[PDB]
Amino acid sequence: SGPDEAKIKALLERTGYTLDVTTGQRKYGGPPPDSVYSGVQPGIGTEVFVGKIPRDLYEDELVPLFEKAGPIWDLRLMMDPLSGQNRGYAFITFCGKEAAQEAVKLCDSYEIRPGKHLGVCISVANN
């Protein structure tokens, strides 16, 4: 297990996004390169929750899929600091509401690995 360093490296060389690893989290972009998006942090309705991510799957797989909805502002893959695998979920901020809704339409139930379907929804606050 663990992310494939070569695959991650080629991803960042292709897209130019930053990738910052902290305890419990991998943050892709946030902000993206301003060539992708200049502007204030995207607001309400622009973030999706992505669940049921296979625990050994990392950004080299997630980013090309969700880029099909639109340009990514940030991707935060939550990590288990004890196992060094991801926690099974991530938050993805897009640059607009329309792209976030497109991520739900395209990627909710997407079979990213055999037998493993993602759950995707607009991330909203509780009450």
- How far does Cα 104 stand from its chain's mean position? 13
Helix runs in the chain, H state only: 5-15, 59-66, 97-107
Q: What angle do CA 44, 19, 108 make, to 5 degrees?
A: 50
Does domain 5-122 fall under CATH 3.30.70.330? My reply is yes
Residues after which the chain is broken (C–N above 2.5 A) are none
Neighbours of 47 (CB within 10 A): 20
Closest CA to 88 of 112, 56, 124, 121: 56
Residues 69-96 as b or e (16 or more Cβ within 10 Å = b):
bbbbbbbbbebeeeeebbbbebbbbbbb
Name the residue ranges covered by the structural domains of the chain: 5-122
Secondary structure (DSSP) of 28-41? EESSPPTTT--SSP
d(CA 16, CA 84): 25
CA distances from 111 to 28, 65, 88, 120 (A): 22, 11, 14, 12
Closest CA to 37 of 66, 72, 62, 63: 72
Neighbours of 103 (CB within 10 A): 27
The two tokens of residue 52 are 């049921």
